[PDB]
Design a protein around this nucleic acid. Sequence first.
RNA 1: AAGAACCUUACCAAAUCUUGACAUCCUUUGACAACUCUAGAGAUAGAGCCUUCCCCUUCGGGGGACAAAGUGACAGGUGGUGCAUGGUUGUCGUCAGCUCGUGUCGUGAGAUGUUGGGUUAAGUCCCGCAACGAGCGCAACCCUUAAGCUUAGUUGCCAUCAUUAAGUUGGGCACUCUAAGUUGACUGCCGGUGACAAACCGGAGGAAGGUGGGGAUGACGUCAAAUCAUCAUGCCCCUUAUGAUUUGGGCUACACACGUGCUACAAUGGACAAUACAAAGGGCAGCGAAACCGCGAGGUCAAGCAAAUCCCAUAAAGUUGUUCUCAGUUCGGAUUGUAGUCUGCAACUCGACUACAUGAAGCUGGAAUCGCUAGUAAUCGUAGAUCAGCAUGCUACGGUGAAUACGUUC
Lengths: 145, 72, 125, 72, 202, 59, 97
Amino acid sequence: VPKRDVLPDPIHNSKLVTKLINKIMLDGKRGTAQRILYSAFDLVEQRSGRDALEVFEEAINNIMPVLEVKARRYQVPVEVRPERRTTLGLRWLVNYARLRGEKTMEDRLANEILDAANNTGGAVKKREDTHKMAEANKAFAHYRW
Amino acid sequence: PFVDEHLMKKVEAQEGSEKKQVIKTWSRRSTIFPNFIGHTFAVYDGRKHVPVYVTEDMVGHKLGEFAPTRTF
Amino acid sequence: VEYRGTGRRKNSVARVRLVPGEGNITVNNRDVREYLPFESLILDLNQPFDVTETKGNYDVLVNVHGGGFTGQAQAIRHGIARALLEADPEYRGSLKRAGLLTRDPRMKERKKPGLKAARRSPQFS
Amino acid sequence: RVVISLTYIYGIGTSTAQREVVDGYKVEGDLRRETNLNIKRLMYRGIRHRRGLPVRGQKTKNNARTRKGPVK
Amino acid sequence: QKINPIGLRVGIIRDWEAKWYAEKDFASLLHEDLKIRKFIDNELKEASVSHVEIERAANRINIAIHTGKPGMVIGKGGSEIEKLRNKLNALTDKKVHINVIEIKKVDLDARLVAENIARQLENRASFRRVQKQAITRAMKLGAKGIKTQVSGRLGGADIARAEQYSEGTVPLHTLRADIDYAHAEADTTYGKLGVKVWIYRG
Amino acid sequence: KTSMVAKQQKKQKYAVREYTRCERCGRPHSVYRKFKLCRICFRELAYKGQIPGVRKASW
Amino acid sequence: KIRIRLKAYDHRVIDQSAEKIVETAKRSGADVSGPIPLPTEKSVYTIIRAVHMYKDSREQFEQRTHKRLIDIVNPTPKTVDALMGLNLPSGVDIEIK
RNA sequence: AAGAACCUUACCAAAUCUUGACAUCCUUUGACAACUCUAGAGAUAGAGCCUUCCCCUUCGGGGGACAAAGUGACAGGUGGUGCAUGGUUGUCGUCAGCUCGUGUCGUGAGAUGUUGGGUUAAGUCCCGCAACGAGCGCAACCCUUAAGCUUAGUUGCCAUCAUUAAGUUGGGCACUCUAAGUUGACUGCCGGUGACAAACCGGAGGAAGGUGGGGAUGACGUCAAAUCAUCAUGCCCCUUAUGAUUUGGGCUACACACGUGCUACAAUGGACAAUACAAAGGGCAGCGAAACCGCGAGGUCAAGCAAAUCCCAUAAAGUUGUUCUCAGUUCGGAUUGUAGUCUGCAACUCGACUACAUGAAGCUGGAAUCGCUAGUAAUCGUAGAUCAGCAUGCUACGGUGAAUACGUUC
């Protein structure tokens, strides 16, 4: 609950990219995670020619919502504090970048990132799905938790 | 495994002539040498002595796949 | 000219020699390549040489053992911070506002004798 | 590849020695005939060929279901 | 459950009841220590020994006997210790030497009053009278706290209870508190009554 | 039970039936044959202090 | 140089022997190195605490065996007599090298 | 039950014995008898053979210690009873509670202390008060980790050097390591909020800051919770059996319902080659060095070690290159058969494992549900015990290693 932080990686110079590195891992494999993310980042540099901090920052705002429903017996539009916003946006990015059905992860997370800049995929559809469930159940409350 | 047959003196007693009816062993560990096929054993599964006739092809196995003891 | 220090994290002993040079991580005097499997993360251990920007061209000499490779890299990070402590007494607040002399006691916790795998209580029915 | 296209079809499996491979050892389905002749020789662990207990033991009490069915 | 204090305080402040080394064989020393403690258990029926301590230095044993009645292990002037020491030399086939010391304040150690309360409850006395007189005769010597729990078929009872007459500090969790403990069984006609004496003395 | 204790303190048919008992009671299982003591009597002589050996759970 | 392997269980008897033997070799000789300690790796016995049921609670007993190594460099003939003369720790295990 | 081929074994078929398998008294004999041979499955009987006064007395004794009979007192019982029990252990629960002395109030059961305000982790304190105080529990004086130092340098470390396949020796203990002890972490100091008191928050020092982290330690008692199966007991019952020994089954069976755990269901991967790193623990009939032939389970001569030297011991996952190119497959590894290796009078009921070949569900698990707040989860090996041989179970250590905790609303 003071929610302490880990140092940023100096390959792609951001603090969001080491949270993505720590989010994509499985069974404690960090070297497998660095093997499948930096090659996906170089596939981003070889396909759409722009530095990936800008298109990753502009693509994570197409996944991130501003409303969230939390039901209790019900639905409220609570605004989200931004560390929770960015960890649910990264968790939706990995959890729909694990379910595409392609050859490797380096061609699976990277075109999902470039689909999130062109507002397609499964992640921007999940942002319109939580906006649809928060707008269809806007009517019940503004006050509950 | 190296093949032992510890009761070899019971085999060579009745071997030259016609072999006697049914001879018994209280050991299923007695590994079958290939010279007492036809020696009719009564082997012990725990309950009583169950007869077995060593016919033609059971040189490589013991006396314990024959006479079962788990029934059904 | 040869600052013999020490430093550890997670059962990984480190003994630095701070010598003036251009700078190369010589772990067991070999390389930075074969020993560490993070050749991409070679600036996690370079952290007191980028948070103290007085000079970042200094050579380290270790021949050390212990633990793994991430804990050995943060152990020689602790040895680099200990060599920057014993090199200059005015670096210390430049240490302490970034931390970096904080020995973390985060070791692998003990196997609890009723539980299965050390806060892994074995599945109540 | 060539060497891992031959592991599930009969004869050669995965770790043998290597239009040349047409010849050699028992590469056809005669080993299926030899396995059926050996299970004909045992039919004595034919009392547990309705079960899944071998010559070298199973402990079937709750799980021998690969020579059995799902619920059955 | 309540752990015993002599388990918790060996190798903290109170020393072990055996001081030797054995690494290679190691079962030919401890079981002979068990049979020599079972042989001092025959003279526990009159002598009232608290504990013996095995000092096997290299060949002979300077076994330290601690009895609250010190004049009846030695006999008249030293005969009973010598015929006892010859019986131990027969019954372990090793060399022993009896080291006796004369311990007074007999109602301050747990094993002497535990065998005394189990002796009084063998002789069909009522348990509350010997319990209150044991804790008040241990306080009129001067003690820092005496728990005395007798349990089982209480005085020839049908249902087992647990009669504990705690008095004063018996602080089992402060670990620099040298607490004597003994449980002694009493073979009464109505079963087996276990006493449990827990004396803290600072 | 002193039946099996009176049996196994004698030389036998084989040398492979010499299984481990406690040499104080008749307990057959969990016998620490470094001590030749069982599960329970090693706890009792550990708590009395008549084995030289500490209790520390401080690993 | 000769060595002794000073081997006890507890530290309460190894310090009195390591003060006795070293100063006996100092007062009867010259240049005896100190009681250099070993890592003293221990033996943990883990039993269940109960009798019949209950493997959910268990019990530890560890057995530590402390070892000091004492080196006598250039041993005088009075030292090899006077170390074997007085023997009163009563429970340490001595090996001679 | 941390070891079920015989033994365990109590249970069951057979062979049997009745002072018995064994404890003890008495008489007779006596430094015991082991070892080979016959029947038998062995237990048991039967041959060769005296080990045959070892401490000591005149010849005969006494008796450390054995054997036979009388079977006489006695055995023996893992037989029944935990609802007669001790001893021992779980759960509430490491939660913060529970009681007592004296006094007061109350006809009395009882209450007060223990409640109310604030507080923390706490019945931990402070304020006011018919309460005053005390005791078990919480808080540590206990151990380990977390930073140097006094000390002592070997089998361990190589500053600085000669020098090698090797820190392997010359030298040293510079650093490191290791341990008997020292100094420290105690809201200790400052500020704010605080009744000026308890404390909370922030900052500094410190390696660690708010019981520093983890373990042990489990109150009064509850469940008539478990154990007459470690042991003894209180009662009952047998004692040519319910006591004993041995061979063969046995706890190691399935048409099954359930609990725990492993393996996975693959591209994060499957296979091939090089290469990195440690802790913790054990070893004398045991640990098997190098080398050797073995595809391989292992086997041969075998240094060294009663243990920082010698061994288990390559720890594994990682990194670098290659293949596979998304499937019931290049995954799997159950099953069956053959060749086998090893322990052990022995692998058939029933041990571990190697090769070859067959390759069966399994392509992510519903209603429900379990565990976890930081080195945690997950994954991956290593070591100990039991063990003559046997682990995905227990125990202990180590590598990589995340987010979540708006809140406590239900």
